[PDB]
Design a protein around this nucleic acid. Structure first.
Ligand SMILES: C[S@@+](CC[C@H](N)C(=O)[O-])C[C@H]1O[C@@H](n2cnc3c(N)ncnc32)[C@H](O)[C@@H]1O
Ligand SMILES: [K+]
Ligand SMILES: [K+]
Ligand SMILES: [K+]
Ligand SMILES: [K+]
Ligand SMILES: [K+]
Ligand SMILES: [K+]
Ligand SMILES: [Mg+2]
Ligand SMILES: [Mg+2]
Ligand SMILES: [Mg+2]
Ligand SMILES: [Mg+2]
Ligand SMILES: [Mg+2]
Ligand SMILES: [Mg+2]
Ligand SMILES: [Mg+2]
Ligand SMILES: [Mg+2]
Ligand SMILES: [Mg+2]
Ligand SMILES: [Mg+2]
Ligand SMILES: [Mg+2]
Ligand SMILES: [Mg+2]
Ligand SMILES: [Mg+2]
Ligand SMILES: [Mg+2]
Ligand SMILES: [Mg+2]
Ligand SMILES: [Mg+2]
Ligand SMILES: [Mg+2]
Ligand SMILES: [Mg+2]
Ligand SMILES: [Mg+2]
Ligand SMILES: [Mg+2]
Ligand SMILES: [Mg+2]
Ligand SMILES: [Mg+2]
Ligand SMILES: [Mg+2]
Ligand SMILES: [Mg+2]
Ligand SMILES: [Mg+2]
Ligand SMILES: [Mg+2]
Ligand SMILES: [Mg+2]
Ligand SMILES: [Mg+2]
Ligand SMILES: [Mg+2]
Ligand SMILES: [Mg+2]
Ligand SMILES: [Mg+2]
Ligand SMILES: [Mg+2]
Ligand SMILES: [Mg+2]
Ligand SMILES: [Mg+2]
Ligand SMILES: [Mg+2]
Ligand SMILES: [Mg+2]
Ligand SMILES: [Mg+2]
Ligand SMILES: [Mg+2]
Ligand SMILES: [Mg+2]
Ligand SMILES: [Mg+2]
Ligand SMILES: [Mg+2]
Ligand SMILES: [Mg+2]
Ligand SMILES: [Mg+2]
Ligand SMILES: [Mg+2]
Ligand SMILES: [Mg+2]
Ligand SMILES: [Mg+2]
Ligand SMILES: [Mg+2]
Ligand SMILES: [Mg+2]
Ligand SMILES: [Mg+2]
Ligand SMILES: [Mg+2]
Ligand SMILES: [Mg+2]
Ligand SMILES: [Mg+2]
Lengths: 346, 106, 246
RNA sequence: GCCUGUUUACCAAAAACAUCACCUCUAGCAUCACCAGUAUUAGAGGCACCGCCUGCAAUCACUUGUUCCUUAAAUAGGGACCUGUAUUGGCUCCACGAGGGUUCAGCUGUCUCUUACUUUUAACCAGUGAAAUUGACCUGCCCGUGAAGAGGCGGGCAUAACACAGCAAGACGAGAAGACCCUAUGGAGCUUUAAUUUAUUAAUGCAAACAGAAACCUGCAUUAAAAAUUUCGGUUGGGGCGACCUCGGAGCAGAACCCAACCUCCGAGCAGUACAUGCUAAGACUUCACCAGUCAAAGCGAACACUCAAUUGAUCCAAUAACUUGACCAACGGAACAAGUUACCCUAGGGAUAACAGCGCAAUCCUAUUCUAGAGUCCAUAUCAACAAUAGGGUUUACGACCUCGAUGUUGGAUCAGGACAUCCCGAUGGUGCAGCCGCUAUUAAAGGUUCGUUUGUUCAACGAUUAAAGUCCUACGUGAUCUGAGUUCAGACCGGAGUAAUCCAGGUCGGUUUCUAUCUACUUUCAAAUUCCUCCCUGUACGAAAGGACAAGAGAAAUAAGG
RNA sequence: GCUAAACCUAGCCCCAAACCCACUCCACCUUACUACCAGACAACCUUAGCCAAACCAUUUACCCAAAUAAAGUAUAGGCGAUAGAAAUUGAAACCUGGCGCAAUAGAUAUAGUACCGCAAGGGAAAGAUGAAAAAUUAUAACCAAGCAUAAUAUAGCAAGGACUAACCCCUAUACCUUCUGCAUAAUGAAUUAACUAGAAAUAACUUUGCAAGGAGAGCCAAAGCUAAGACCCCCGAAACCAGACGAGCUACCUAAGAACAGCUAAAAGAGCACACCCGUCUAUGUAGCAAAAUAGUGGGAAGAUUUAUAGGUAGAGGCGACAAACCUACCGAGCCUGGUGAUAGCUGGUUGUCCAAGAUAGAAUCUUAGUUCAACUUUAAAUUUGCCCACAGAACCCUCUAAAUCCCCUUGUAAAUUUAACUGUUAGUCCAAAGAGGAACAGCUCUUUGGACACUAGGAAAAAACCUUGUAGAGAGAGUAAAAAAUUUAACA
């Protein structure tokens, strides 16, 4: 029989407050004096970048955005490659506002083709797609692709002949299908070019070995932006405490499976929307040791310092990261938080 | 979850049963039984008799429609000489369409 | 009474209660099935088979004009003015076998029933009776025991005026000049030779029609029937005469 | 705890309340209170005199470890040191107290260990004469069985009748539908940011009504105040900080249908294409009822029953000219709108249902064999033992909810014990890595015995001194109509913690009603066989190189036990 | 043969009719029943709540002045439980009665007395001769429990089969109720007598009258209509509201009083210690002396003391050195009366005989202690198939390639469906089998098939679930069914 007369009961905290307390302890030591600056940006609403849909009237949309003083940071960054001196995924146009500007883009309006003119997404989430260095004729595998923040960006490039978008949750997958349907014309999705499935990412390490040249792996993680604001399906509630404990374990397993899926000589980018170093660098180091000990697979992590300097103008970067690149949010540049690490298989 | 009850789907008219027009013959989730002579199929693969008569079940050669791509791709990979079979439910009409009766003597 | 519960203790719930779920009758949506049921007009049907049955047995004499009083007096109909009855309606049942020349006045009449009577040489006229005068017509004897002067029946309501002002329905307020034209159309439609009732000996009896403000035959409104002394009292006040004649 | 004082009349006299002292809050004044008073006054509170104290966080208190004193023995009492936390707040001091602990000497039948006497009671004779109680009884023991604890059933044994006096193991003894958990669309108190209201009260505003400005009154409003009404969804979960409630698919459910969880897995609360996704109408299916839900020929009218497993919400009502539309009513067959707490609790019931117990079961626990790897210098088997195997036991921890919810609180102790032998001691006998003493191990043996103390409510345990030994258990975890009431358990209070509060607590502290006249069974002198240690002698003998050091038999002395 | 038992009146109930009483003398609103002095004192103000809505919050019938009819209609209503007209219609009418009661009945009544409570208020019990008691030589017999006459003899639900015979022999696990299942150590009952618990006619059915009409205005009618017969319990809360009654106990206050030896000390809420008050500890007592006491031991005892007297504060409250204390011996909200026969899905009870049919799918539910519907069951009625079952036939991704169903002519048989009218059961058990959860444990939990059990008997020791076996009586006949455990083990070159 249950006992309902406990002497002391733990006070009920909101899931937002629960997430805030855990982040406050962990991230204060990790970031030091930058945590108060980061914390305000996390609590403030993030800036939304307008990703131009190439399938629609991209040139006309670009002219429309220029009227709202929007500036294509991607086009500016491309010209910066030679200025500083794999390159990056081409055919991406995302317009944002100036540093410290709070203006919000109007909601997207379907064009004459019947597809949305542009997609609103975090500008920090576009970097892993750019860091992926996509090239035409490649076969791209995306794990946890739903709801399609990075999935849509791959199709805008037009460099992927075959795509494998897999997310474990069918509800997220259903959102991905609608986003692709509304934006990407049916002709591309008509064939086997875009394959949307709902299975465990751990299976991809065995079912499809060395099939894909470019693999983008965004494992699930404690989303700092969503946890501090959303009250639904928060990972920090008591019922989901078990999932948070086993969360780093899944991050190591899903990343390792994706590394097995890629062909030797291919590129794999590990992406995570969190500031916790125990889930950003340790997971990356965990997968590297896991492959060598169990499957004897060696990978090399590329240097993103060259990539860091190009987007320093429009993004804030943390210069105390062992392997990956971490983009921390700021009041002037609200994009983030985003962590992306690029490793190639040899 | 998974507390859903059964849908009570199956054979409503067995072999040799006398049926009338519109009577439901069988209800199925998938095409376990295929419509035969004077047997219609609804949206939910519900087989109903189009004519009054006796219900018969036979095994017939299955030739899919060319427009149905999925079934066409299945017979094209079969070894030469192999033929697919499926169960078909037929209704053999019992009464004729009508009779000619004398009505007047002009 | 069973074992315990509300059955043995006699605390059963009200009729229609289903243990807590929404009752069957409650969950059915409301519709205007019976809306205004107490204001709808009801008419007792009178078949020509019933009318011919009464005539052959002598319960209704065809030599005299037939009104609602004669039908009630012959136990042919049972009118309930308290039950929103407005008279009798003549239906077409048994029109083939009907063969009698009568002068019957009914509140409503179908086109075929009108044609059947006029084919045999009869006369059919439709008049309106208000509920107050209806009880007087059905049971004159109880009304004469109240010691009240006979009131004039009121005109039909605004909705029923078109029915009684049209010669097709043989309304009692219709223009008599349009009756010959309407009578011939029924003869042509149903294919029967319309007899000339003027040459008939009963022509005077057929033409006998009561005034729209009159209740009985030969009894002007305002008169007081004294059944104890077999006498009728007629007021001579000028204002009273103007009230009972207008 | 300042003190005298006060409180639960009938279980708590206190650490609780009050109390001078101090602090805070409110109020500028007349004609029943305050008060016939007026800021040195009055009222509403907190703390409990007095004295002392910094930083501008120290000092202290609390806390985690360590040590010392007392005792033969100290989970107690007293003091000191280390760590952490906490701060207006904290620390001392008289006196005092039926308050709660420790102790010196003394005192004593409190005890070792009881005994004698008187009185009452008692028993008998005489008089008077109750009460609870009672299905009927012609009222036995053992074993078994059974709704799981039998005087009544099964199998054995015993058995003339019969009163009186004792006894308290049984009659799950008697006494208040007992306490204890649970149930109810049963109550009540209390608290509140539960819901529903401002009638009432007070303060403003306007209207009214006036003067010429105002007040009173009345109406309508808005603010609060103080109250009023009512409710506390189910499901599941002993060590938590909840999940779950509707709909669909797969396994169980293997082949027509149907078929459950705490079950085993994945989801759905949409989107897209249509715009005849128009109008009508035979015959059928139907999620086991109903409500809903599904298919559909023909016909009319046009062209030349949309995809999808789920993708959904009834009635009333509101909106609307109409057509139509409206609820994570998600507690999803939906109440138009209501939360906690009760140990101050009350009523109706429940062994359908908890804890203790009994019973089932043997995961755990326990024991012996089988196996022979491995320890034991060599060597499986003097001993010891792995992976396992084979059986037994019902002492722990669990699991089951079958019996008891119309008077057993449980633990421990005192008293008296009956029984098992898987033997702690005494006895007999193999083996030994048994020289002798000591030991180890195994077979046999239940006739007899199995201590006194310190802290602790203790069971247990720690160590104190002993003993041939200070056995493992069972018996309603024996025994409470024999006793005890210390711990826990009802009302009081405090410390710490939780909560806005009421109030709560697996913690600490203090106090707290233990009824009964014996009707029945059983029993009330087993007429009487005793065990053990030490010393001595054998004997300083056998043994041994010495060191050491025995058997058996006999004697003496002492102790307990039994009987005088 | 004692106690007893009987014994019919008193009187009452319901109607009718009629509109009722209230100054002999004296006393009586002050402390009522008190002869006899200066007063000023005034009545009027919505009922609420229980209860029903299965909670509850709007709401929920209560003579309002003519029976019937209109009519349970119009309307009202969380449009829901339920509430509910009017116009209009028009009624006879003779008090002197009883298919009422007969001392546990009928009024409580012999009496609002005795008695109980401070008060409001509650509220009894019983009598029995005869013409004559101025016949007591009286009103004879028999009859409940309880006794007495007349204690008891192995053994056991107290009996039955019996028997020459009481016992001895054989056989037999009290009753009611509640549960799947009670000899059960679960409930109730000491016993005797009396009293004490199924009220309603919408539909349907049955039997008459009349019939396309029926009916003694209204109403119904596509064979109906009228009339009759025939179905719907008792006791019990804690509560809520209204109006009264209570501070002679107690809590505090007011008025005016009383008490406190002696000693030590000092002008003390001082010390010791009587009266007095209080009730710490222990024992006795526990239906007691006592619904809180006795004995001893204690605290205070010149004060915030104790105490007599009168008055005050009254329940939505008082009062409180706050103990949720006290407010007339059960105060987390007094008592009494009324609403009230409150309500209770809960507990208990539910009265003569005999026969017949008669058990385990579910769904919904502020619902799992209930109810509604279905299933099942019963009666009546109509009709024709029902059950058993030969082939044929019912899926693939899937070889646990399962046992076996569904369908189903013959055939064996006699039921089945539909119509009408409603009740009741559904907190199930165990065994075999398949499969889940637990531990390849449980008299464990949860589905499925089948059996048994709640229906008798025999056999397994006693025995609800295993086996045998059912349709009912008598016999001092007969044949059978199931039905009684086996097993004793090591030489060796
Ligand atoms: C933080 S979201 C990333 C969304 C997307 N990658 C983007 O950046 O736009 C991680 C997603 O991974 C999916 N996921 C969680 N567990 C997964 C698993 N085991 N295998 C595949 N996907 C998983 C979840 O549905 C979740 O929506
Ligand atoms: K007292
Ligand atoms: K004290
Ligand atoms: K006893
Ligand atoms: K509900
Ligand atoms: K008892
Ligand atoms: K119930
Ligand atoms: Mg299922
Ligand atoms: Mg009962
Ligand atoms: Mg004190
Ligand atoms: Mg002092
Ligand atoms: Mg007391
Ligand atoms: Mg006391
Ligand atoms: Mg105090
Ligand atoms: Mg004192
Ligand atoms: Mg001493
Ligand atoms: Mg005597
Ligand atoms: Mg007595
Ligand atoms: Mg005897
Ligand atoms: Mg026994
Ligand atoms: Mg026996
Ligand atoms: Mg005796
Ligand atoms: Mg005694
Ligand atoms: Mg309920
Ligand atoms: Mg009310
Ligand atoms: Mg159905
Ligand atoms: Mg529901
Ligand atoms: Mg449903
Ligand atoms: Mg307490
Ligand atoms: Mg032995
Ligand atoms: Mg015990
Ligand atoms: Mg005891
Ligand atoms: Mg005892
Ligand atoms: Mg105690
Ligand atoms: Mg104590
Ligand atoms: Mg002695
Ligand atoms: Mg005088
Ligand atoms: Mg005088
Ligand atoms: Mg109610
Ligand atoms: Mg209630
Ligand atoms: Mg009487
Ligand atoms: Mg007798
Ligand atoms: Mg016998
Ligand atoms: Mg009151
Ligand atoms: Mg007084
Ligand atoms: Mg003195
Ligand atoms: Mg003094
Ligand atoms: Mg006192
Ligand atoms: Mg004390
Ligand atoms: Mg006294
Ligand atoms: Mg003194
Ligand atoms: Mg008084
Ligand atoms: Mg006091
Ligand atoms: Mg208190
Ligand atoms: Mg209290
Ligand atoms: Mg009282
Ligand atoms: Mg009742
Ligand atoms: Mg029978
Ligand atoms: Mg509901």
């Amino acid at each position: 029989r249950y006992k309902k007369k406990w002497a002391a009961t733990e006070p009920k905290f909101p899931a937002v407050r629960l997430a805030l307390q855990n982040f406050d302890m962990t991230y204060s030591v990790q970031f030091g004096d930058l945590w108060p600056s980061i914390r305000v940006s996390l609590l403030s609403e993030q800036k939304y970048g307008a990703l131009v849909n190439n399938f629609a009237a991209w040139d006309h949309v670009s002219a429309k955005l220029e009227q709202l003083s929007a500036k294509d940071f991607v086009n500016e960054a491309i010209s910066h490659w030679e200025l500083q001196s794999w390159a990056c995924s081409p055919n991406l146009r995302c317009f944002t506002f100036d540093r410290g500007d709070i203006s919000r883009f109007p909601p997207a309006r379907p064009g004459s083709l019947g597809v949305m003119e542009y997609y609103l997404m975090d500008a920090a989430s576009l970097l892993p797609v750019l860091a992926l260095g996509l090239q035409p004729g490649d076969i791209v595998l995306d794990l946890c692709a739903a709801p399609g923040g990075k999935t849509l960006a791959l199709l805008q490039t037009g460099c992927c002949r075959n795509l494998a978008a897999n997310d474990l949750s069918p509800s997220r997958i259903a959102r991905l299908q609608k986003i692709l349907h509304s934006y990407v014309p049916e002709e591309i999705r008509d064939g086997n070019q875009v394959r949307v499935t709902s299975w465990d990412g751990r299976k991809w390490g065995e079912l499809e070995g060395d099939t894909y040249d470019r693999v983008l792996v965004d494992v699930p993680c404690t989303t700092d932006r969503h946890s501090l604001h959303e009250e639904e399906n928060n990972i920090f509630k008591r019922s989901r405490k078990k999932e948070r404990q086993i969360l780093p374990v899944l991050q190591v397993q899903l990343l390792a499976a994706g590394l097995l899926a890629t062909k030797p000589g291919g590129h794999v980018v590990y992406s995570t929307c969190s500031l916790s170093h125990l889930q950003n660098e340790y997971v990356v180091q965990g997968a590297i040791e896991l492959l060598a000990n169990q499957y004897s697979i060696q990978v090399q992590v590329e240097d993103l310092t060259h990539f860091r300097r190009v987007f320093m103008d429009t993004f804030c970067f943390f210069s105390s990261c062992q392997v990956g690149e971490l983009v921390i949010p700021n009041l002037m540049a609200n994009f983030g938080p985003m962590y992306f690490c690029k490793m190639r298989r040899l | 979850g998974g507390k859903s009850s059964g849908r009570r789907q199956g054979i409503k008219k067995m072999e040799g049963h006398y049926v009338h027009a519109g009577n439901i013959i069988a209800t199925q989730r998938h095409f376990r039984w295929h419509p035969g002579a004077h047997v219609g199929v609804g949206k939910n693969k519900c087989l109903y008799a189009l004519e009054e008569g006796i219900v018969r079940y036979t095994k017939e050669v299955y030739v899919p429609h060319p427009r149905n791509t999925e079934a066409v791709d299945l017979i094209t990979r079969l070894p030469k000489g192999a033929v697919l079979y499926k169960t078909f439910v037929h209704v053999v009409p019992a009464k004729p369409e009508g009779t000619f009766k004398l009505v007047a003597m002009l | 009474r069973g074992h315990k519960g509300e059955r043995q203790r006699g605390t059963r719930p009200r009729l229609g209660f289903e243990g807590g779920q929404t009752p069957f009758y409650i969950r059915i949506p409301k519709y205007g099935f019976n809306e205004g049921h107490s204001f709808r007009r009801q008419y007792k049907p009178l078949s020509l088979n019933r009318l011919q049955y009464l005539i052959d047995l002598g319960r209704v004499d065809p030599s005299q004009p037939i009104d609602l009083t004669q039908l009630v007096n012959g136990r042919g109909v049972t009118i309930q003015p308290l039950k929103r009855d407005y008279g009798v309606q003549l239906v077409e049942e048994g029109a083939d076998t009907f063969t009698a020349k009568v002068n019957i006045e009914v509140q409503l009449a179908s086109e075929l029933a009108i044609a059947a009577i006029e084919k045999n040489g009869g006369v059919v006229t439709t008049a309106f009776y208000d509920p107050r005068s209806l009880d007087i017509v059905c049971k004159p004897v109880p009304f004469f025991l109240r010691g009240q002067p006979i009131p004039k029946r009121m005109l039909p309501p605004e909705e029923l005026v078109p029915y009684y002002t049209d010669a097709k329905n043989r309304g009692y307020l219709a223009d008599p000049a349009k009756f010959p034209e309407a009578r011939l159309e029924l003869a042509r439609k149903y294919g029967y030779i319309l007899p000339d009732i003027t040459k008939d000996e009963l022509f005077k009896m057929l033409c006998t029609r009561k005034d729209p403000r009159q209740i009985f035959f030969g009894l002007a409104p305002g008169w007081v029937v004294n059944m104890a002394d077999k006498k009728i009292l007629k007021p001579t006040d000028e204002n009273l005469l103007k009230y009972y004649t207008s």
